[PDB]
Amino acid sequence: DDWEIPDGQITVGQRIGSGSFGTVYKGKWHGDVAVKMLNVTAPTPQQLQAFKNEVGVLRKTRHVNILLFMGYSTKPQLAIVTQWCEGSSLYHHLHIIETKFEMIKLIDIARQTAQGMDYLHAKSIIHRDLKSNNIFLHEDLTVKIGDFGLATVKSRWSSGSILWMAPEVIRMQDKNPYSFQSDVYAFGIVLYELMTGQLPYSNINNRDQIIFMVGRGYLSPDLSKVRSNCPKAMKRLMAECLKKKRDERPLFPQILASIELLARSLPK
Ligand SMILES: CCCS(=O)(=O)Nc1ccc(F)c(C(=O)Nc2cnc3n[nH]c(OC)c3c2)c1F
């Protein structure tokens, strides 16, 4: 049963992981691994059980598009270990190395990512912070969605990502704004990243202004910066995913359907 990895087995190496939510190290354990050390100090069994609890959510995931969870650690520190993806994250491709994909690929990356979420949603998991940074890109062919773990551990132990936030999320309204449709909107944003190779609202220099405006639905993404080689009913789908009221957003089965439809409507 238990997925714990005893001390000394894992061999930590190069550093890459930033943030106060945890530090990611490249490692070696039955091959190259990724290790996210939770960068706490030494928390008390009320917290330990809460970690064990978040793992219990991860092991529910077995899907080519979901980043592979391989085991957790405790004795050196609290840790989650995953497969190591060679190649770079989606945010890196579009926004740092300016990688121009064929339109066929862009549509595919979408399909896979949508595929990944439909799964997560079927197993009652809300990603809550899907963004192109969390969409890893293996051997430059396969989509691997990460960072959906540890939702509990953010609230129990008290920036960025605002671009992906649906209105209801942005305006920090009630205690639970996070829904499936919450994630769909964040998807809509990556759809806009793919089709325009650009972050939205890049012509507004004051963050709080974005935040206020998105939350009140005064400013939404500029769909007209899609390239010409992009399909007509791609715009329609982004529009669907990006709706201000969350009811109007389609769920992933239906999104997926619309992508498969337009995907195999392109090569001819
Ligand atoms: C899979 C479910 C567990 S989770 O907590 O949702 N996500 C989760 C947990 C632990 C990790 F190390 C990671 C992670 O970012 N891994 C990771 C894996 N391979 C990489 N190649 N290049 C990178 O960047 C340079 C990588 C980063 C992760 F995304």
Swiss-Prot record:
Signal sequence extent: none
Positions annotated as active site in the UniProt record: D129 (proton acceptor)
Cross-link (Glycyl lysine isopeptide (Lys-Gly) (interchain with G-Cter in ubiquitin)): K131
Tissue: Brain and testis.
Residue span, Protein kinase domain: 10-262
Post-translational modification: Methylation at Arg-216 decreases stability and kinase activity. Ubiquitinated by RNF149; which leads to proteasomal degradation. Polyubiquitinated at Lys-131 in response to EGF.
Origin: domain of life: Eukaryota
UniProt effect for mutating L150V: In NS7; also in a lung adenocarcinoma sample; somatic mutation; elevated kinase activity; efficiently induces cell transformation
Resulting phenotype, G22V: In a colorectal adenocarcinoma sample; somatic mutation
Annotated positions binding ATP: I16, G17, S18, G19, S20, F21, G22, T23, V24, K36
Consequence the record notes for mutating G22A: In NHL; also in a lung adenocarcinoma sample; somatic mutation; elevated kinase activity; efficiently induces cell transformation
Resulting phenotype, V153E: In CRC; also found in sarcoma, metastatic melanoma, ovarian serous carcinoma, pilocytic astrocytoma; somatic mutation; most common mutation; constitutive and elevated kinase activity; efficiently induces cell transformation; suppression of mutation in melanoma causes growth arrest and promotes apoptosis; loss of regulation by PMRT5
Coiled-coil regions, chain positions: none
Omega-N-methylarginine PTM sites in chain numbering: R216
Localization in the cell: Nucleus; Cytoplasm; Cell membrane
Record note on quaternary structure: Monomer. Homodimer. Heterodimerizes with RAF1, and the heterodimer possesses a highly increased kinase activity compared to the respective homodimers or monomers. Heterodimerization is mitogen-regulated and enhanced by 14-3-3 proteins. Heterodimerizes (via N-terminus) with KSR1 (via N-terminus) or KSR2 (via N-terminus) in a MAP2K1-dependent manner. Interacts with MAP2K1 and MAP2K2. Found in a complex with at least BRAF, HRAS, MAP2K1, MAPK3 and RGS14.
Family statement drawn from the similarity comment of this UniProt entry: Belongs to the protein kinase superfamily. TKL Ser/Thr protein kinase family. RAF subfamily.
Disease linked to the protein: Defects in BRAF are found in a wide range of cancers. Colorectal cancer: A complex disease characterized by malignant lesions arising from the inner wall of the large intestine (the colon) and the rectum. Genetic alterations are often associated with progression from premalignant lesion (adenoma) to invasive adenocarcinoma. Risk factors for cancer of the colon and rectum include colon polyps, long-standing ulcerative colitis, and genetic family history.
Free-text function comment from the UniProt entry: Protein kinase involved in the transduction of mitogenic signals from the cell membrane to the nucleus. Phosphorylates MAP2K1, and thereby activates the MAP kinase signal transduction pathway. Phosphorylates PFKFB2. May play a role in the postsynaptic responses of hippocampal neurons.
Entry protein name: Serine/threonine-protein kinase B-raf
Included stretch of the parent chain: 448 to 723 of 766
